[PDB]
Design a protein around this ligand. Structure first.
Ligand SMILES: NC(=O)c1ccc[n+]([C@@H]2O[C@H](COP(=O)([O-])OP(=O)(O)OC[C@H]3O[C@@H](n4cnc5c(N)ncnc54)[C@H](OP(=O)(O)O)[C@@H]3O)[C@@H](O)[C@H]2O)c1
Ligand SMILES: NC(=O)c1ccc[n+]([C@@H]2O[C@H](COP(=O)([O-])OP(=O)(O)OC[C@H]3O[C@@H](n4cnc5c(N)ncnc54)[C@H](OP(=O)(O)O)[C@@H]3O)[C@@H](O)[C@H]2O)c1
Lengths: 381, 381
């Protein structure tokens, strides 16, 4: 997927664009399942606005409320039952990546006569899915315009990504105002996640053009410049707009399907979230820099390039490796300066379960084995 | 369409990616109409490669050869008759924007019991279309990933753009090698056209984010830096790759659907091509800068921004209007430095038919009337 660029979701970006819902729903069925999280959309007033638009569209509404961060497969199965109960034609996901990922799993589960966990574990390949669209309230995992979904089995302590072109969103409404009330920590997590997709793309071997590299470096620089201002001024339209734009539309100009499918490359983060339920991007901030150090290429050209072009590392009097490692230091220091965690200790995680986590994570050049995962976990304590 | 970002075509980018045709054709029917132009694809060897892949796909091939630059509706109607005769399931356009635009009109015409010119003139809105894909051989009109098509009626001397979401290409294969033999003049025209889509986006009112502006400015600067090198080294892979990337994938990060639909904003170029059959982007090089001068906003902030940030105009001691107009001067001077035409005289066009051309062009704030069109034409003689 590294040479494939495919983003078929219709994006509508701007203030008040929830009012485009009736037009976008016109071609779909009238029985709509509205899927959302723990209540933030009611506190912001977005819920009432969505209901108002759904009434204007003449649709019959039922709801699945309470999707959890790191969405549970029990919640997926509950949504599937609601789809059968209410003869749902179309789903509307209003929330963040957990809500959208959950809606994708419901949309596919609705066409499968079995436990939705079979889709997550790739036991059943989806052959059909209900259509759905999104109203994004957190910038920005990419789920609002990609084909992947990451679901937790809390009973077995497993968290796995799966995907299907049948669960690309039909449309996604992207309004910076709808991200105003994302609290500080999840605003940080959203930006850590955005940046991580760009790193994943950049680290591909011999599949980036030089201009694509410039696009990625500029994106990273703009997130880095904007993030400290946003975290101290969370209801600022232009700051929220910058992060929403750079985390959504802009990335269609540089991210391959492989980078948008990078939910297949974070086994360690998944295993830690599977056991302790920490936010995915909190795991990224703790673990990804130590993964970069553990796997830094013996030709550190690509990370050297990022260190110099994004993190302003002065290479005079340094080896290329010193420059590359300094870039990783500056990345982690930047995330920490926003308030991101940088040790498992920050989430009250000690070394008690590192062996079990490594086993769960293990369930080309530089690929990891169990000792690699254990070493990265220990370095992150 | 200025707040909508929608590019559903699957893009496959890189050397040799014509070999992905069988995988992509798996999902479509086996009766394929292969559509191409005047023979450049046979001289380059691409024709034989495509035939080999179609055989590998088990496809039954029929051909429509000889699509002309500024494709004629007679060619469209001929393709429609072939679709009915041979029970065509899928079309494969191998060529440039004229071939792809023609294929779109055939794909929609194949579901319409009437003259395909009714679709071009918007008398008939397509309600269905055959699916199709492309192999792009000229960088890059955007037809390979947008929903529009510009067709000439050579009998009536008319050229009109039309569009429909039903004629987005399913997939497009983008290999820089397939553009190596584009001659110098059409290499120039492709880059003039690329740049003009970016200008169209940039000129939208209050619908660009600041980061989007930076993306557009950077794209323009890179084409400007790359174009003179490419025109003197046409079979250079990295130079062809830069122009193909900036003219295709990169633009999905900054162009709204309205900018990708800017075939509705070039009435004057269309009328001149309708009468004299000149290349569309030759018309752009001659007419677009004079349209910019004729319509320069009385708040020249946006064009001043382009003048300073893209064309490096030093604003010290100058008015904002002087700077904006100098930017337009620098744009036209740049296109001319590549070899693009800058006067209607360059195509042996005098003033004899300007009134007829203005009538053909006339068939919101700053919209043009006939006197406006005549003034721009006279300024361009
Ligand atoms: N499919 C992919 O490719 C992909 C990529 C990256 C990450 N992911 C996954 O996405 C999930 C993380 O998604 P996420 O970072 O967007 O966060 P999230 O888990 O969807 O939500 C995190 C928190 O943000 C709150 N929230 C969201 N929008 C809010 C708003 N406008 N105002 C106030 N609070 C708001 C939510 O509260 P409420 O519940 O009350 O609304 C929730 O508690 C992870 O499970 C990750 O594995 C998937
Ligand atoms: N749909 C839209 O939104 C949109 C946007 C912009 C422009 N347009 C339209 O696109 C058309 C212009 O398209 P275009 O600029 O791509 O050019 P084109 O009209 O498709 O082709 C121009 C010339 O380039 C030759 N050619 C193409 N690829 C070649 C290659 N690899 N090697 C050698 N020769 C090659 C062609 O020769 P052969 O015929 O022998 O192959 C032809 O003579 C216009 O009619 C314009 O109105 C549409």
């Amino acid at each position: 997927h590294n040479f494939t660029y495919w983003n078929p979701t219709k994006l509508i970006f701007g203030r008040g664009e929830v009012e485009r819902l009736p037009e976008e729903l016109k071609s779909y069925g009238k029985n709509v399942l509205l899927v959302y999280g723990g209540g933030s959309i009611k506190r912001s007033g977005l819920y009432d606005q969505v209901i108002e638009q759904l009434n204007k569209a003449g649709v019959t509404v039922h709801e699945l409320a309470g999707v959890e961060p790191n969405p549970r497969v029990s919640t997926v199965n509950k949504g599937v039952a609601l789809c059968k109960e209410h003869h749902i034609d179309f789903l509307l996901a209003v929330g963040g990546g957990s809500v959208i990922d959950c809606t994708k799993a419901i949309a596919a589960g609705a066409k499968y006569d079995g436990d939705a966990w079979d889709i997550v574990t790739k036991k059943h390949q989806p052959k059909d899915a209900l259509p759905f669209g999104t109203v994004l309230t957190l910038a920005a995992t990419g789920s609002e315009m990609n084909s992947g979904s990451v679901i937790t089995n809390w009973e077995t302590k497993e968290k796995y990504g799966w995907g299907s072109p049948l669960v690309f969103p039909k449309f996604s409404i992207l309004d910076p105002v709808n991200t105003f009330t994302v609290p500080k920590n999840h605003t940080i997590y959203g930006m850590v996640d955005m940046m991580s997709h760009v790193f994943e793309q950049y680290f591909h071997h011999v599949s980036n053009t030089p201009y694509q590299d410039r696009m990625c470096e500029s994106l990273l620089r703009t997130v880095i410049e904007t993030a400290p201002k946003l975290i101290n001024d969370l209801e600022n339209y232009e700051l929220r707009e910058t992060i929403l734009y750079t985390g959504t539309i802009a990335l269609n100009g540089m991210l391959s399907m492989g980078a948008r499918g990078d939910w297949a490359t974070h086994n360690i983060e998944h295993a830690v979230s599977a056991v302790y339920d920490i936010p995915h991007a909190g795991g990224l901030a703790i673990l990804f820099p130590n993964w970069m150090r553990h796997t830094l290429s013996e030709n550190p050209a690509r990370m050297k390039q990022l260190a110099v072009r994004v993190f302003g590392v002065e290479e005079a009097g340094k080896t290329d490796k010193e420059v590359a490692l300094e870039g990783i230091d500056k990345l982690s220091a930047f995330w920490t300066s926003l308030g991101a965690p940088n040790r498992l200790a920050d989430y009250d995680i000690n070394d008690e379960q590192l062996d079990t986590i490594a086993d769960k994570a293990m369930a080309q050049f530089k690929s990891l084995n169990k000792e690699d995962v254990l070493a990265i976990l220990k370095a992150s304590l």
